[PDB]
Symmetry: C3
Subunit: 108 residues, 3 copies
Amino acid sequence: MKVVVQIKDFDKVPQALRSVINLYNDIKDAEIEVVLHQSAIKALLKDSDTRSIIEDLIKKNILIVGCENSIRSQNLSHDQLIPGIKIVTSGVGEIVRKQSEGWIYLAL
Amino acid sequence: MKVVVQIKDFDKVPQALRSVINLYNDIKDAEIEVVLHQSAIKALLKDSDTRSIIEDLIKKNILIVGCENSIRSQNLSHDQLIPGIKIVTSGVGEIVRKQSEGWIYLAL
Amino acid sequence: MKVVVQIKDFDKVPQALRSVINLYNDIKDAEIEVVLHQSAIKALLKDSDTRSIIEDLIKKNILIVGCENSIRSQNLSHDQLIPGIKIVTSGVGEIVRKQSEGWIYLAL
């Protein structure tokens, strides 16, 4: 079950991440990709309060993706992001493309 | 027309419910399922300010679903929820599954 | 690539519009329709702070759509909206219908 998850609001990241954990626990063999854009990109910073949760999702083989446009608008450096994070040119472009590829969309 | 509606933010429930009413009025013979998770689950409490609206949606044959994970994290009891409410193990799992079954997704 | 974009929160319109610009720049020959409903409808007012951005999207051949139900609940007049704006009876009905027609959904 392929699911492309979107997270855009930084203030809702904690709840969004718990929801992703819920998804993982509920759908057997789920193939999950989480795309963070807009202000939510800040959650991928090395000193992020949700770093341990993000690292746990990575351990669970979940693909964590950050939006380049968002990284740039938030004045962040790739050097400052959690290691092992994939980046796409556009978070919204990725979300749309994955859906066209058959991935089920979930907005958090 | 099968539509699976998601509502996750408690502070936006009033507007979300009005939007569902709008959907109902706009799409003839719509088959609607509303899944509430995260903080929005509180709207399904018996003393909820939106109870009368929820009851009206039920009257209109709309399926109202509450997330068990969310009920648990909000420390709520099934005894405290509006009668006639269906519950799923995971709100996000339900949203994803209905979409895979052909239901059109609407995030409110 | 057909994409139906939803924007419902007025306080998030600036970021949503930038995200639409990002979509446009990222997906070659994207066919985009943006549906604004709930409080976001206010962004289509003639004296709107985002008017110039909306006009730019229109220039880029992006279809800008406003929800009639939302226009009514916000006590707005069609005379007060940006010229060239299309209106639908229900923003949510449009979002659902476009998806059933094969348009990819993006919630902003």
